[PDB]
């Protein structure tokens, strides 16, 4: 519309703004003052129609976002780069007989040692710039400015948790879709059939069986067997919310919950699995709209002409931009009746959060300091534990 209001014309006069004094190397020095009227507009009180509108409160809403897999996180010393692991293969006890060659007492019997070698993690970073002169214009107390400087920092702590939780639930779906053997994969037909298969596959763990681990794709576990058991204190179902609302809605969940394990807290579920994307073709960055889209989510370091390798992850919705279409797929389970029952010790996850406040660079030209947050996180998944995937594929 259009407004011929005496106060709205004063409001919309942008040549008087504070931004004019900070986007020009020479600017206005002394203030004459302004006539402020609250008549026949908003901000109008019944008494004293000539005062400036005043703030009752300003409220920093700071939500503590949590990583649900944080109790799995071991902490290492960030030294070397290859973590390896190994088991001892089964040798079943044999009957003894007193009528043998009796120089087989001299014979040897070594253990057999299935292993697997893991690479490194990656170091991740994020920064935030806080200045000292222009952000003071909009808090009216020192306490609100310090709460702002602290809320920015705790948001930078919280989105690390969001990143790591979304990253690990992308790992556990990428694993089961692509890398997992089709011996651990059971196939369902309908939702009640899948519920009965999930509830019999929980009970297919806690059993001394060499059938449910992928020790055959360890380095030395191709011949022989390796028997794994799993308690119920370390079994986790990873599924969707539309299917957790059906698994918990059965009488078997009630008899698990009564006098026993908390079955609500062993079923880790999400809305539908995957907001994380993968790169399949090594592309480059060509357009400024994609650069600004990456700047919106805090990715400051990437510029035009940067190449993205095959297998890089993004952790937000990227596939709508012109040069990402086709080059980028999604870690999303096919035929969303989906449940992946694992032992929680299979997630080999360790970090290094020792010294993640690197000391600030001041930049006293603009008086805008910068704090960086560096952390090393190693995400892997071990083959020596019971895993079952129940899909319709």
């Amino acid at each position: 519309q259009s407004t011929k209001n005496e106060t709205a014309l004063l409001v919309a006069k942008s040549a008087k703004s504070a931004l004019q004094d900070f986007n020009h190397d020479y600017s206005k020095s002394w203030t004459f003052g302004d006539k402020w009227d609250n008549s026949n507009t908003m901000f109008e009180t019944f008494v004293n129609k000539y005062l400036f509108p005043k703030i009752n409160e300003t409220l920093l809403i700071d939500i503590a976002l949590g990583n649900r897999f944080n109790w799995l996180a071991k902490e290492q010393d960030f030294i070397g780069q290859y973590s390896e692991e190994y088991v001892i293969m089964d040798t079943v006890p044999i009957n003894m007989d007193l009528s043998k060659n009796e120089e087989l007492m001299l014979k040897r019997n070594y253990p057999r040692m299935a292993t697997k070698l893991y690479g490194n993690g990656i170091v991740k970073k994020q920064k935030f710039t806080l200045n000292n002169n222009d952000t003071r214009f909009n808090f009216q107390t020192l306490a609100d400015a310090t709460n702002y400087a602290l809320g920015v920092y705790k948001k930078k702590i919280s989105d690390i948790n969001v990143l790591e939780e979304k990253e690990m639930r992308a790992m556990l779906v990428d694993y089961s879709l692509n890398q997992l053997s089709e011996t651990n994969v059971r196939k369902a037909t309908s939702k009640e059939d899948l519920a009965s298969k999930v509830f019999e596959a929980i009970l297919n763990l806690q059993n001394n069986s060499a059938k449910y681990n992928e020790v055959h794709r360890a380095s030395g576990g191709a011949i022989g067997q390796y028997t794994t058991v799993s308690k119920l204190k370390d079994i986790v179902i990873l599924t969707t919310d539309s299917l957790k609302s059906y698994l918990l809605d059965t009488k078997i969940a009630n008899t698990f919950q009564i006098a026993g394990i908390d079955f609500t807290d062993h079923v880790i579920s999400f809305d539908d699995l995957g907001g994380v994307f993968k790169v399949t073709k090594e592309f480059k960055l060509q357009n400024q709209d994609s650069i600004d889209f990456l700047r919106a989510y805090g990715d400051y370091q990437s510029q035009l002409g940067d190449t993205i390798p095959v297998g890089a992850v993004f952790t937000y919705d990227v596939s709508k931009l012109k040069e990402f279409t086709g080059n980028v797929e999604e870690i999303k389970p096919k035929s969303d009746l989906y449940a992946f029952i694992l032992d929680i010790n299979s997630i080999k996850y360790k970090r290094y959060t020792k010294g993640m406040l690197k000391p600030p660079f001041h930049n006293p030209e603009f008086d805008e300091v910068t704090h960086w947050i560096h952390y090393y996180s190693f995400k892997a998944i071990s083959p020596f534990f019971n895993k079952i995937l129940i899909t319709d594929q």
Binding site: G66, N67, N161, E164
Partner: peptide, 27 residues
């Protein structure tokens, strides 16, 4: 093992690793 002047400026203390104080929020 050999120290000489081992605890020198910021990097010689940065490998003698520093201040596990802030960890991530859940546990």
């Amino acid at each position: 093992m050999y120290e000489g002047n081992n605890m020198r400026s910021m990097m010689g203390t940065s490998y003698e690793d520093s201040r596990l104080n802030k960890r991530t929020e859940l546990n």
